Amino acid sequence: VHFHPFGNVNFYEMDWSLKGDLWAHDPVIAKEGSRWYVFHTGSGIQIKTSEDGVHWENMGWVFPSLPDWYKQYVPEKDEDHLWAPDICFYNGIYYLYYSVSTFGKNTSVIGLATNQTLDPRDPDYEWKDMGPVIHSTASDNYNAIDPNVVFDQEGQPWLSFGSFWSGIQLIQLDTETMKPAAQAELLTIASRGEEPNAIEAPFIVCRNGYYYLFVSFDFCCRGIESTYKIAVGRSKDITGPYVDKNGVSMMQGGGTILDEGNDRWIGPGHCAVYFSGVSAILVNHAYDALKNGEPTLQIRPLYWDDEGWPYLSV
Ligand SMILES: [Ca+2]
């Protein structure tokens, strides 16, 4: 996947028994050369690195001091946590989208940081503040958080995003600015059809001519009382309709459940899906019932059945 490259390594062969610094919430992963990186929710966007994808070490943050412009969109934000980063690699540049918001409110903005490299040893390492991408106010019927970029088969970048309110949104990006045109249409592509509308954290991938929309249902952020689950649907066209195994549109609460956790891992969600060759991984967090509900990084091989639907195993 040109914009999420993982070399030749074979995820289905690897031992994904993670070790090290595994606290994480809302992760994404990128690999540049021999080094792997996690970005996740936390102060200034938290970063972890690994040599192998398995042993993780905490490594700094993107924004030591938050951009002044956040206050123009979310003036009541009073702490430095940035949420749900998303990484892609295009034209030599790393594009890191992220969320500026306050929990449970839809006064929100997605920002963009860019870097020439992910390696802080490189003289050109610098996370540049490239400003807002899309925002919501309290009279909008959507929430501008939880970005994900996908490039369709034809090379057009799209941004999906959303949490609660009318649900998951989709908008085209321009290839040079990596932002929507000012008159670009905003499409709604998934919704529980319930109030509150507990759907968020979209992630789209293409496999064999279908677009797969992964989302998280129900409630994060409650430790062992979290009810998060990972759901998926698919469409031949990136604008929908995304439908689940049963033929139900994701605009009507459709979605096939991929993981709802167990008595040890509570509330898995906020996922990402990456490929290397025909192998794939699912990345998410889950709340550790054996460690005070602390949110923990999970990376697992993601298999695909003979109808094209993803599944986990043991
Ligand atoms: Ca995400």
Side-chain angles (χ1 to χ4, degrees), residues 28 84-85 147 202 270-271:
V28 290
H270 205 113
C271 71

Side-chain angles (χ1 to χ4, degrees), residues 3-25:
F3 56 96
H4 297 153
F6 281 89
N8 284 110
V9 63
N10 181 155
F11 297 145
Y12 288 168
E13 284 176 343
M14 286 171 56
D15 176 10
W16 289 110
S17 287
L18 305 186
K19 298 298 189 194
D21 295 334
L22 302 181
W23 192 107
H25 206 267

Side-chain angles (χ1 to χ4, degrees), residues 2-311:
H2 65 90
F3 56 96
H4 297 153
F6 281 89
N8 284 110
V9 63
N10 181 155
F11 297 145
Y12 288 168
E13 284 176 343
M14 286 171 56
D15 176 10
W16 289 110
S17 287
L18 305 186
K19 298 298 189 194
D21 295 334
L22 302 181
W23 192 107
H25 206 267
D26 316 316
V28 290
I29 301 189
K31 184 172 179 295
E32 178 184 28
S34 60
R35 303 183 63 192
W36 308 57
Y37 301 83
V38 164
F39 299 88
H40 74 256
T41 295
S43 290
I45 309 169
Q46 291 286 300
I47 315 167
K48 305 177 189 286
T49 192
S50 176
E51 300 286 359
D52 59 2
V54 183
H55 297 89
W56 291 95
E57 187 157 338
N58 284 354
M59 205 182 71
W61 42 89
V62 173
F63 294 106
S65 68
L66 292 201
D68 281 349
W69 66 261
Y70 296 173
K71 294 184 195 215
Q72 198 58 32
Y73 294 88
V74 194
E76 270 339 297
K77 186 175 176 70
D78 79 315
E79 37 61 55
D80 66 1
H81 287 214
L82 295 174
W83 315 342
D86 184 68
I87 187 68
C88 71
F89 179 59
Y90 185 60
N91 290 141
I93 297 175
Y94 291 91
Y95 296 88
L96 185 71
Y97 297 78
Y98 61 88
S99 317
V100 184
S101 190
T102 65
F103 193 62
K105 324 227 176 12
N106 71 325
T107 302
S108 304
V109 57
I110 290 163
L112 174 61
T114 68
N115 207 326
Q116 294 190 88
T117 180
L118 301 183
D119 187 352
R121 304 172 291 174
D122 188 303
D124 291 325
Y125 182 86
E126 181 183 1
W127 286 106
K128 296 182 178 170
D129 172 16
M130 301 310 218
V133 178
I134 190 157
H135 70 295
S136 49
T137 78
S139 64
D140 287 313
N141 74 348
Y142 61 91
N143 190 9
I145 67 177
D146 287 4
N148 172 244
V149 174
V150 67
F151 284 72
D152 66 22
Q153 287 183 316
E154 300 84 358
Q156 169 72 54
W158 298 77
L159 180 72
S160 63
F161 66 93
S163 172
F164 291 69
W165 287 263
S166 65
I168 305 309
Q169 318 298 136
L170 181 69
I171 191 164
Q172 280 198 158
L173 298 175
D174 174 86
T175 52
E176 300 323 297
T177 63
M178 286 291 286
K179 297 190 181 186
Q183 295 183 276
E185 185 163 13
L186 190 61
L187 302 177
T188 308
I189 63 171
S191 177
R192 309 299 300 283
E194 296 172 343
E195 303 283 359
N197 188 15
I199 190 171
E200 69 188 7
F203 199 102
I204 300 176
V205 305
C206 185
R207 186 175 186 271
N208 322 297
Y210 281 97
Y211 296 94
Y212 292 80
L213 172 62
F214 296 80
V215 297
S216 299
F217 285 180
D218 303 327
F219 304 110
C220 75
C221 309
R222 296 174 187 176
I224 67 170
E225 292 171 0
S226 302
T227 57
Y228 237 10
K229 316 168 179 58
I230 299 167
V232 68
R234 73 188 188 180
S235 181
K236 288 207 225 65
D237 298 323
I238 196 150
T239 52
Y242 292 84
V243 173
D244 70 13
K245 283 182 179 183
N246 290 145
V248 177
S249 171
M250 298 189 76
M251 282 294 299
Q252 305 309 141
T256 295
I257 304 302
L258 184 59
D259 187 8
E260 43 188 80
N262 58 42
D263 296 328
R264 193 252 181 289
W265 290 117
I266 313 298
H270 205 113
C271 71
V273 173
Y274 299 110
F275 296 85
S276 188
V278 297
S279 79
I281 51 177
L282 182 69
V283 183
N284 61 271
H285 69 256
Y287 303 90
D288 190 345
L290 292 175
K291 192 166 182 228
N292 307 292
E294 295 157 14
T296 307
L297 185 63
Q298 297 192 302
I299 305 170
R300 293 171 287 180
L302 187 65
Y303 307 107
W304 303 81
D305 70 24
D306 282 319
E307 301 62 25
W309 293 95
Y311 68 93

